[PDB]
Amino acid sequence: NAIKYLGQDYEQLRVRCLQSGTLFRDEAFPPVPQSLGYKDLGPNSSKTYGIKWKRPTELLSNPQFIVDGATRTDICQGALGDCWLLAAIASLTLNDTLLHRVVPHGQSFQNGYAGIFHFQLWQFGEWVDVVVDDLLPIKDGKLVFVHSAEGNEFWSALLEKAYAKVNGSYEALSGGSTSEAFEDFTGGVTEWYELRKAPSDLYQIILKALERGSLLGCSIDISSVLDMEAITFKKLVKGHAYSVTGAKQVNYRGQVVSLIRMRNPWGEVEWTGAWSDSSSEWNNVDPYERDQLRVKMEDGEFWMSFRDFMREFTRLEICNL
Ligand SMILES: [Ca+2]
Ligand SMILES: [Ca+2]
């Protein structure tokens, strides 16, 4: 069982509020400017213009914690540089057991709701249970930071808030290592690969890791300094954390091709090359595999041949449990 972060007891607080007919207000991470940031998101920064704090129950009639499952498409980056964290959460959703530990399912905005939620995070050698009240940064009636493709789903926004909490603020989440989040969601350890000097069996390593439920991420190195999140001509993003969400060898024109699937945590802007959603490669793949693997949707997720992946990406991270 997880340790209580800052001694905060989710069940107790929830019961206490539920009994007092009140909603939880987190003293350890209040809906104040400091919780948003200190510099670019500081009290006197224009980026915080119009940002207010509101509970989902104050925005919609029936907000939901989880809708159609807690999946990777529920992770769509907002106005914050926490791609590393979001790619980790999206990868986390693929390991059903760990996902259910980090994200306690069964939390709802209906039965037993008292404006409080909790999440488990592995922090400095131990699993800790972190609580947050459900006040979230909103602007123009929309979540400012992470949001699900589904506007009425809030589990991911709440998880990001809990992660911001352990970091002192949302701004503190700007800039980071996907490896760190992978480990904080698993208690596992990340091994990194320099794709230009990778094992001949790297694809097999990726296959086995995905099957085991390890978390995988990848990125393109940025040596141009300020080309951070620069979109390439083929619509890959540099200095940006991607979730490696799949890998399968497919029967193509009667042959076998090694593909890798990844997801841009933005939830949009996808590779336009071979194997992308509407690419012609799919016309010559087995009708069943095409149906199982290819989804024509601007959801940030797409396939690439392993060769193109090795040619376009510079690093791969595998966090094994
Ligand atoms: Ca969902
Ligand atoms: Ca897609």
Side-chain angles (χ1 to χ4, degrees):
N1 314 70
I3 291 312
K4 299 164 195 171
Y5 186 65
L6 303 184
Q8 292 185 107
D9 193 307
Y10 167 78
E11 248 317 285
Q12 181 210 63
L13 297 170
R14 186 186 79 69
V15 166
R16 187 165 309 188
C17 288
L18 205 54
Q19 78 189 190
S20 301
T22 54
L23 303 184
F24 181 57
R25 289 182 164 187
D26 190 4
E27 308 192 313
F29 193 62
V32 306
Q34 165 161 49
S35 287
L36 285 181
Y38 41 92
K39 182 165 164 286
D40 291 305
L41 291 178
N44 286 169
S45 171
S46 62
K47 288 190 173 183
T48 59
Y49 168 84
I51 294 177
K52 314 180 182 70
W53 290 83
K54 283 186 169 59
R55 300 175 191 271
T57 53
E58 293 171 345
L59 297 175
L60 312 174
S61 61
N62 260 70
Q64 300 292 134
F65 186 57
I66 295 178
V67 180
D68 302 316
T71 69
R72 59 198 183 290
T73 44
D74 306 341
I75 309 303
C76 296
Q77 199 170 333
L80 184 65
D82 67 342
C83 62
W84 54 283
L85 169 64
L86 271 26
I89 298 173
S91 287
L92 170 65
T93 66
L94 300 168
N95 185 132
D96 210 44
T97 295
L98 265 289
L99 168 60
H100 281 80
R101 137 103 85 170
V102 169
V103 177
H105 280 48
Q107 296 187 78
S108 166
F109 289 99
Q110 288 66 240
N111 292 308
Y113 172 78
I116 178 179
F117 292 81
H118 70 122
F119 300 91
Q120 284 207 236
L121 299 179
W122 171 268
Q123 294 288 91
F124 312 100
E126 69 189 358
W127 278 101
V128 303
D129 188 86
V130 182
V131 307
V132 293
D133 60 44
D134 62 347
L135 287 162
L136 290 162
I138 296 291
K139 179 171 184 170
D140 292 345
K142 289 300 177 290
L143 292 167
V144 180
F145 301 128
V146 75
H147 50 283
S148 166
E150 260 302 73
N152 58 144
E153 183 175 45
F154 295 87
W155 75 264
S156 61
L158 290 165
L159 174 55
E160 186 188 45
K161 183 183 177 172
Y163 207 87
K165 174 169 181 179
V166 305
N167 273 272
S169 66
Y170 276 97
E171 183 166 352
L173 298 183
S174 173
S177 174
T178 312
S179 281
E180 174 163 358
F182 279 163
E183 298 164 358
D184 287 359
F185 287 143
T186 65
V189 68
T190 307
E191 65 197 16
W192 59 297
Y193 293 90
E194 192 192 311
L195 300 185
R196 286 171 183 176
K197 283 145 76 177
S200 66
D201 64 328
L202 179 56
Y203 187 76
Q204 212 54 45
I205 288 174
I206 290 171
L207 278 179
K208 297 177 291 183
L210 283 166
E211 179 227 283
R212 284 179 302 168
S214 299
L215 306 196
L216 290 75
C218 57
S219 65
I220 303 167
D221 283 296
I222 273 173
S223 49
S224 310
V225 175
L226 212 308
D227 49 306
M228 351 249 234
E229 280 176 301
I231 303 170
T232 69
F233 181 95
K234 292 170 190 176
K235 306 206 175 226
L236 288 184
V237 183
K238 301 188 272 186
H240 184 57
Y242 279 77
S243 303
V244 167
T245 64
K248 187 165 179 189
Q249 298 189 304
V250 303
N251 290 281
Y252 165 70
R253 291 178 167 176
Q255 286 127 284
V256 172
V257 187
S258 284
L259 308 181
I260 179 163
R261 182 181 67 190
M262 71 189 66
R263 179 176 184 279
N264 176 338
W266 283 349
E268 66 181 80
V269 181
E270 304 180 11
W271 163 243
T272 60
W275 299 105
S276 51
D277 290 4
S278 300
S279 64
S280 65
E281 279 73 22
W282 292 109
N283 306 322
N284 306 313
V285 63
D286 174 290
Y288 162 61
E289 299 189 311
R290 174 202 299 152
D291 189 74
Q292 166 187 44
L293 307 181
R294 188 254 265 140
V295 181
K296 291 191 175 187
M297 184 61 53
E298 180 58 26
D299 48 12
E301 188 161 71
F302 55 83
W303 294 89
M304 293 179 89
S305 66
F306 183 64
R307 189 189 174 76
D308 279 327
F309 165 83
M310 292 300 283
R311 192 162 179 273
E312 306 286 336
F313 283 87
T314 57
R315 34 192 308 155
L316 167 72
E317 303 146 297
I318 304 188
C319 181
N320 292 298
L321 285 58

